[PDB]
């Protein structure tokens, strides 16, 4: 009964803190969208834009805004088909490489925090030269270095 | 808490804290905090939901403002005969009781979907304080634990 | 030649904790099984209620 047309495994979603928008039919997807606000102060938007348009129209990420606040994201060249534009705050992009194989592009980004609350949700608009996406996204802290951070009495 | 996680929380009054910037190594808060941990109706389970699951939630009448973003808090004591409902299924959003296999929908205000439980899990209203810690905005709106003859509903 | 109740592996009692296969002894399993098979037939009589486990 569990191998049916509705199964538990086939329903499951990515155990990640960000949201996603786009289907099998949509030309441009966004994956793992989340407003990353550090516990020190820095903030930004984490996301991955993915072009999969079969008409081979490139999409340039023109602008990103979070609860109406503009995002600074360093210069990105357009996303051709089966290319990916990765984005995070620079402190977290320094922890991974930028592949020479395939088509991946890392761009740092940052927000001026108006005072978002941890745990909450805010609407995020991606605007491409072809169109637009709107998606709710949770405000969250970035991940830690695994296995180094003990907690203390304070 | 991450975006599909569950913590067991207890009521910690401000007079028993002794951590953070106000920590004193001579303040001995242990026995009162244990008294809080060992109350029968004290345990609550604080669940952070994914965003796309949080926007599928069906609230209960009168309890629409109890959550805080993606944070929901439910009484951990089962409404059947009192076991802790400590098994949060992170993908199905069922809260499962190990004693007699009652299943509660967390995207449906804790309403049972299997087993012998009949009543929904009580929900705790929560919020954050000025210093950025999570507090209980109020008391539960219903009696909690198993049912008795005197309990309405 | 065989363990029967490794109480040390279970830890002291805490109202907030529980285990998966937390069954009673075999001579009581029938009562627990009764509690499992009974459906959620509960009566709500105004200000009163007869629980399902009745």
């Amino acid at each position: 009964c569990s191998a049916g047309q509705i199964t538990q495994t086939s329903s499951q979603v990515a155990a990640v803190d960000g949201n996603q928008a786009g289907s099998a039919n949509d030309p441009v997807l966004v994956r793992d969208v989340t407003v990353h606000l550090t516990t020190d102060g820095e903030a930004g938007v984490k996301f991955t834009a993915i072009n999969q348009d079969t008409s081979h129209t490139s999409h340039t990420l023109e602008s990103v805004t979070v609860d109406g606040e503009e995002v600074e994201l360093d210069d990105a060249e357009p996303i051709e088909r089966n290319c990916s534009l990765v984005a995070d705050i620079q402190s977290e992009l320094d922890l991974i490489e930028e592949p020479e194989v395939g088509c991946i592009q890392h761009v740092a980004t940052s927000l001026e925090n108006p005072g978002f609350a941890y745990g909450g949700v805010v609407p995020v608009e991606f605007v491409f030269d072809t169109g637009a996406i709107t998606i709710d996204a949770t405000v969250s802290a970035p991940v830690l270095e695994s296995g180094v951070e003990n907690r203390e009495v304070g | 808490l991450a975006a599909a996680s569950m913590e067991t929380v207890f009521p910690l009054p401000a007079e028993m804290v002794n951590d953070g910037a106000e920590y004193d190594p001579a303040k001995d808060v242990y026995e009162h905090q244990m008294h809080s941990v060992h109350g029968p109706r004290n345990a609550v389970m604080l669940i952070r939901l994914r965003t796309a699951d949080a926007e599928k939630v069906i609230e209960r009448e009168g309890q629409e403002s109890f959550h805080y973003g993606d944070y929901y808090a439910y009484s951990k004591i089962c409404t059947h005969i009192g076991c802790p409902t400590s098994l949060y299924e992170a993908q199905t959003n069922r809260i499962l009781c190990p004693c007699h296999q009652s299943q509660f929908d967390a995207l449906h205000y804790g309403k049972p979907v299997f087993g012998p439980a009949a009543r929904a899990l009580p929900q705790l209203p929560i919020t954050v304080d000025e210093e950025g810690y999570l507090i209980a905005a109020g008391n539960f709106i219903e009696p909690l634990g198993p049912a008795f003859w005197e309990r309405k509903s | 030649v065989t363990t029967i109740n490794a109480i040390w592996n279970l830890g002291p009692y805490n109202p907030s904790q529980v285990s998966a296969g937390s069954q009673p002894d075999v001579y009581m399993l029938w009562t627990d099984g009764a509690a499992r098979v009974m459906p959620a037939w509960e009566l709500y009589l105004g200000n009163y209620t007869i629980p399902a486990v009745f």
Binding site: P114, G115, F116, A117 | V57, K111, S153 | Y44
Partner: peptide, 24 residues
């Protein structure tokens, strides 16, 4: 045979928004 105080909320969740005050 159902609890008479366990209804669905008539009003739908409005996708509200949170914030915190700050020194700057």
């Amino acid at each position: 045979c159902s609890p008479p105080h366990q209804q669905d909320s008539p009003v739908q969740r409005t996708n509200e928004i949170l914030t915190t005050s700050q020194n700057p």
